[PDB]
Amino acid sequence: LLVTPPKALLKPLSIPNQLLLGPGPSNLPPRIMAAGGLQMIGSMSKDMYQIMDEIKEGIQYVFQTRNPLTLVISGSGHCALEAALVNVLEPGDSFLVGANGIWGQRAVDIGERIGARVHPMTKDPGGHYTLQEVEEGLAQHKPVLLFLTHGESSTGVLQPLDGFGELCHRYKCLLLVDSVASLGGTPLYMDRQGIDILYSGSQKALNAPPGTSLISFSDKAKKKMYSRKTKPFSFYLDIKWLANFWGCDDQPRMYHHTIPVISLYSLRESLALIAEQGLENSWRQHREAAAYLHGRLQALGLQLFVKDPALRLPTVTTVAVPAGYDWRDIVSYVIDHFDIEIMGGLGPSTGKVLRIGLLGCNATRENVDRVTEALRAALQHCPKK
Amino acid sequence: LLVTPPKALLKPLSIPNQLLLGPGPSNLPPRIMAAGGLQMIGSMSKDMYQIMDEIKEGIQYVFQTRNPLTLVISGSGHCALEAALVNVLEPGDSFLVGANGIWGQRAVDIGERIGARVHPMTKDPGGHYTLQEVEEGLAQHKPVLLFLTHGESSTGVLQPLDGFGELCHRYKCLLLVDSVASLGGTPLYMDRQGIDILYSGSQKALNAPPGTSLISFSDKAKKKMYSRKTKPFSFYLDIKWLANFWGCDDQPRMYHHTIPVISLYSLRESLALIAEQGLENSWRQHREAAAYLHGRLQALGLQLFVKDPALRLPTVTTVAVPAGYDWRDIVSYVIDHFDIEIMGGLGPSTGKVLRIGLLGCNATRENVDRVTEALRAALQHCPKKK
Ligand SMILES: Cc1ncc(COP(=O)(O)O)c(C)c1O
Ligand SMILES: Cc1ncc(COP(=O)(O)O)c(C)c1O
């Protein structure tokens, strides 16, 4: 044979112990690890459908929606975003985007690829959108769809959502919201806030492993996706097929693709955990953990990148890189000496920030203390121009 | 709150003990279960990249390729097929498809959606392509890409592959092969056989959980994907981005999407297990387990759907549904009474066949015997038309 068994593969798997305090993925609690170690069941068995149905109820709970077109996307946060866009948007459709961070920039990229006429509302990192600004975009561009990031994990921003749905609906625009970083960490009410498409991911405050994502569509969104003149560019993400297999339509489930059974166990357990805790209690925990972190970072002489506390995303905090340091030095020091992962910036915030995540079971004052101690040490050991 | 905590989630997760002898997914051996129970590491950590590098080596081993553009797709087998098509095919490209089962039909569907000029070579379930049939399509349709299913798990057919890559190259056509159901279970040699795009899935003979897939691209395929004057319709599956993050190009790894860290542990362990067994040993195991199943099925009075033994896929065996039975009765009998899963047909083979899988750790004499006794029972106790 051309290729021999890889020597490295003949060694056993060995992973380091890391406290993951960046913007995700987050460490896994015991129940979620335990679920990940379970045996397979048939991907189209009655028992699998029951688990799926329970996951659906769980998503409806954490999104606060009664939308029946609610399901799991078999891919990461990006894949749920792509699923929303390739299904809602048809070539030529006007697409208004909140490009105030990497996530709006990604929505622009996807939208251009699938033929939308994309209209970015570009805002410096750290900014958020007002009702006035969005209405100017609706006036100008008459979009079929608005994208807004709820939790801007690249900039640390918590985007207000009240009023945007009603505004979009007046202009016959659908409202698409990214809650990958905000879900479970901060108030969110899909139906009350008139959101038409809402997606999140498994690996942020839910503390499930990365690889799945959560999505829900309103009746107005469904009407668009189900009256397209062309098929979506994606078969894997075609919502008509996915809606059927997830039991969201009035037909028996037909095979589309094999769902990630073991990941669905773990997701089920992550939704059970937050259902046990209670949404509002989870919001409380994150709010207070972030407030504690903010004060500890400030005591170090560090400056929070988002100055208005009301606009700070509890789950991902941005810290202005301290003058004189190489942020890469700080990030490396924190993992190398304290086995804690934090991150620098991303997209427009690249080079400008450090990012510290407080996600679910890892949103604790203990972890705030750990990362604060590690940052303190990095500031006095990392070289300062 | 509009929605209160679902009471069903407040109960513990419980799963039944099922022997999965369908065409996939397969049961997990203990080492793969154990990998899936591990703690997280950073998704862009040095240690993660090492694990990715080892998985890449494991893919190059099981595919038998030295292609540097080899990586995991963060999606099921369908996602790897879509990744191949959306990156290789530009709107208007001629696309020749071996449409001899559901997998060719799905390639047609994707090709149509992404604006290719699709030319199906249609065949009835059980059919396979000869070199002369493919050359007639290559001459008539001038394709930039041919899709062939290697292991046609919906029909039980093993498509010969020798010489198809060379033939395609003579017509300046890329060869894309689906080996989701064949990999590990039957001979396959990506570079030797001139295959330009090869993909497989995690949940068949590798016995990993479903949801990841394996893909490799030749330099000829890479040239086409990196030479197009349109961006692919997908960001999530854009090969330029994926190649970078998987360490296949000249640039620092950039964040694209978060890879499924835990699934990569388990996929890594699955590649380690087959690297421990040895490809050829795995081929022998499957060949012998299937030969045994074929004998035991025929001794029951059942007819194998693929009449030419050389065309029989070891990993997935199609059986004619016996006259007078509702195949649904047989399949439900077997899971309801024995906790054994088998399947009916799929796409064109629906209603025509039962499908029995022998995949990796499940490809054993003991499991052939269990399914044989289950079918014996089902034949004795399922209603037969008057
Ligand atoms: C707000 C936000 N949106 C989208 C994503 C993308 O998720 P993924 O990395 O899982 O594709 C992330 C990581 C995120 O924080
Ligand atoms: C040959 C073959 N191709 C493709 C698929 C689809 O794979 P998945 O369900 O993982 O998307 C299967 C199941 C298969 O046996």
Residue numbers in the entry:
A (entry chain A): 6 to 390
B (entry chain B): 6 to 391
Which lines from the publication concern this structure?
AGT is a hepatocyte-specific PLP dependent enzyme, belonging to the Fold Type I family, catalysing the transamination reaction between L-alanine and glyoxylate to produce glycine and pyruvate, thus leading to the removal of glyoxylate. AGT normally localises in the peroxisomes and failure of its detoxification role leads to increased levels of oxalate, coming from oxidation of glyoxylate, causing calcium oxalate precipitation in the kidney and urinary tract. Many pathogenic variants of AGT cause PH1 (primary hyperoxaluria type I), a rare autosomal recessive disorder. Our results shows that two forces generated by the salt bridge between the conserved aspartate residue and the pyridine N1 atom, and by the Schiff base linkage act as opposite springs and are responsible for the fine tilting adjustments of the pyridine plane of PLP.
The tetragonal crystal diffracted to 2.5 Å resolution (space group P41212; cell dimensions: a, b, c = 90.7, 90.7, 141.2), while the orthorhombic crystal yielded a high-resolution (1.7 Å) dataset. In particular, only for this high-resolution dataset, no density for the Schiff base linkage between C4′ of PLP and the Nε of Lys-209 was observed and the best ligand to fit the density was 4′-deoxypyridoxine-5′-phosphate (PLR), which is a PLP lacking the aldehyde oxygen on C4′. On the other hand, it is known that radiation damage might reduce the Schiff base linkage and significantly alter the internal aldimine geometry in a PLP dependent enzyme, especially if the initial geometry is distorted. Therefore, a complete X-ray photoreduction of the Schiff base was hypothesized, to relax the geometrical strain of the internal aldimine. A continuous electron density between C4′ and Nε, relative to the Schiff base linkage, was observed only when the model was refined against the early dataset, while no density at all was present in the maps of the late dataset, indicating that the reduction was induced by radiation damage. Consequently, when the Schiff bond is broken, the C4′-Nε distance increases from 1.5 Å, observed in the early structure, to 3.0 Å in the late one, the optimal distance for the 1,3-protortropic shift to occur. In particular the photo-reduced structure (late) shows that, once the Schiff base is reduced, the interaction with Asp-183 alone tilts the cofactor and brings it in a productive distance (about 3 Å) for the subsequent 1,3-prototropic shift to take place.
